[PDB]
Every structure is written in structure tokens, then in C-alpha cells.
Design a protein around this ligand. Sequence first.
Ligand SMILES: CCc1[nH]c2nc(Sc3ccc4c(c3)C(=O)N=C4)nc(N3CC[C@@H](N)C3)c2c1Cl
Length: 360
Amino acid sequence: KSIEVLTGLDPVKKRPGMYTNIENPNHLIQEIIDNSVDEVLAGFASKINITLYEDNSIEVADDGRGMPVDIHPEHKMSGIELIMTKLHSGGKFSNGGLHGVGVSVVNALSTRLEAEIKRDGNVYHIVFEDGFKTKDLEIIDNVGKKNTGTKIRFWPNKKYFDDIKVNFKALKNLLEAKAILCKALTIKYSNEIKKEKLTWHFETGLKGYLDHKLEAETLPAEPFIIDNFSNGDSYLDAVFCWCEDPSESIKNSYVNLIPTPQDGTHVTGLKNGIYDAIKAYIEKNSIKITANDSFAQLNYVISVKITNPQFAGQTKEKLSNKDVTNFVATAVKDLLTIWLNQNPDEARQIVENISKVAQK
Ligand SMILES: CCc1[nH]c2nc(Sc3ccc4c(c3)C(=O)N=C4)nc(N3CC[C@@H](N)C3)c2c1Cl
């Protein structure tokens, strides 16, 4: 943290398009959910509950530690006020975005935002309007010391959005995706407009996912799974297979359950680790095959969980953390190598297909 920066929310209000997808409030919902997900990945939360109200407001609630309320000695303001009313950034050297900016973006772009925090046996409540605090942080009730979490309700400001109606189908798709990638999590959704409720919880995580999305035949017939590989503090889940029917193609990547549509170091890690294992298997067992060839017919889902994710690109949709490439590549190389060794009939066919890709 060589440079640390704190500003007001005016930049967000001036160019909402640089901080959110303004077609509807779905991206704002994703931002709040990403912050509760960080509690789940830290080990402190297991439940995220989403409510869509008839007044078009959205509420997200978790059972995490509860957003901090302590008065910051310098800024003279509770943690929750500081987090909500200011844009926080920093980095190693001087240089918006759809990720890595913070929940104050949601505050900036809402007419109203309420927060209830359960922490230390206290229920705290605070209110904001248009990104400014309008009701003081106050204790409104007591709870047991172990009854904890954060609940945020917000009313997107029509001034900044094409439509303030939440896109139900896209939200359900996003929730299902997150639940698939995180067996510690149960997500509940209540749509008060449609009168529907869903609950997701995937005990088996990604198992069967590619099978469901693809068939078409794949190699391996059973897509290859990497289950909760870790090196201490970073974690990797993945599934991949080759498919010669490019009718349907799945190539999805995430960091901390956040979709990374511009890929990044985790995807590069996967590509390299795969090429490394294919190259070593060909050599250990026998044209010029490249990483592009071994990657060309691959379908995958790759999900890394890391402590301080960094985003790059103008939209901040690409994971940039440099040490991730290495972490993923070694894991993939080693685990796939073991599988190829145990599965020579399918291994041979995978090699043949790749070598056919390379021949043009
Ligand atoms: C409802 C969404 C939600 N839940 C949330 N839950 C928490 S709990 C929490 C997080 C970090 C720390 C603590 C609690 C803590 O006691 N020491 C560090 N914090 C939130 N923050 C803190 C900083 C930013 N990542 C958002 C949130 C948010 Cl937002």
C-alpha cells in the first residue's frame, strides 16, 4: 500500500458508466454480493440472502462478522460510514472500473441506502441518501453475541440508469454461478414482484456442470476436476475437457467468485499448465504443438480464491495478480499429469486431437 487514496463519490456520479453497467441495477447488486462473498471466502459467512422488493429496491444480507462500526482515528467516522461515503483506492505506483472499486459505488448511485449491522451483541442502523449519511449510526436493538452479519437495502437512482427494473433472469444466472463455485455457501432469493423463491446450494460444486452444458461427447468422457487445490492461502477449483463439437463452448473464469470476462493470470496459468502436461506426456511416451493448440478445443471453468485480488484493464475485468499464473500452472500440470498417467486410452486420444489441431 505505497499510495493510498480517498475521494468523494462525485467521479462515480459524473461517469456512472465507468463504475457500473448502467443498463439496469444488476451490476450494483453484484457489487454488494461480492462484498458478502469476501466474508464467505474469509471463513466467516455461509449465507447470502437477496430480496427484490416491489418498490424496485434490492436487499442483500449475510451472516458475516458485520461491517466494522469503530471510529476511524483519522477520518473521525465509523468504519461503515467511511466505506460507504468515499472511494478508496491505492497501489504501488501511480498509473474507474467494474470491479475492485468498492460498495460506495452502489451508495453513490442510489437515492437511498440503509445498512443494518449485527455485531458485538448490537444491531446498528445507518441511512444514506445519494451517497451522504442522513441518519447517524445508532444501536437500535440487541442480539446474541454470535448473531452477526450485514444487511444492505438500496434504491437505485433512475437518473443514472437506462432501466431501474432488475433483470430477474440475469440475476438468477449469476447467483447459480456463484453457488456452484462455493460449497460453503447457500444463496436464497426472494422476488416479491414475481412471488418466487429460490435456494441454491451445491454440495458437489462443479461436478456434472460441464456434462450438463455440453453433451456432445467430451475427452475425458468425465470432465477433469481440480477440487480445492491450495498452497496455503490461495485456492483453485477447475473443470475442463476437450470437445470437438464447437456448437457450444464454455470458457468461464472467476476470482473470488467474480466473473472475469477479460480473463487474466488464472486463465494464462491454466493454458500454460495444460500445455506443460501435454508436452511432458508426449515426450515421456514417444510435429510442433503449441499452447494455443492444446487450448483450442478446451472447455473449462476456472475459479481461484486469493486474498487481495487485483484487476487490470479499463473495465477492471481481467485478473492481474502476477503470482497466480505460477500457482495455477503448477497445480494444473501436476494434477493433469497424474490423470493422464492413469488414463492412457483417453490420454492418447486427447494427444491425437491436439496434434490434429496443430497440423494446421
Ligand atoms: C452486505 C454486503 C457486505 N457485507 C459485509 N461484511 C463485512 S464484515 C467484515 C469485513 C472485514 C473486516 C471485519 C468485518 C472486521 O471485523 N475486520 C475486517 N464487511 C463489509 N465490508 C467491509 C469492507 C468492504 N469489503 C465491505 C461487508 C459488505 Cl459491503
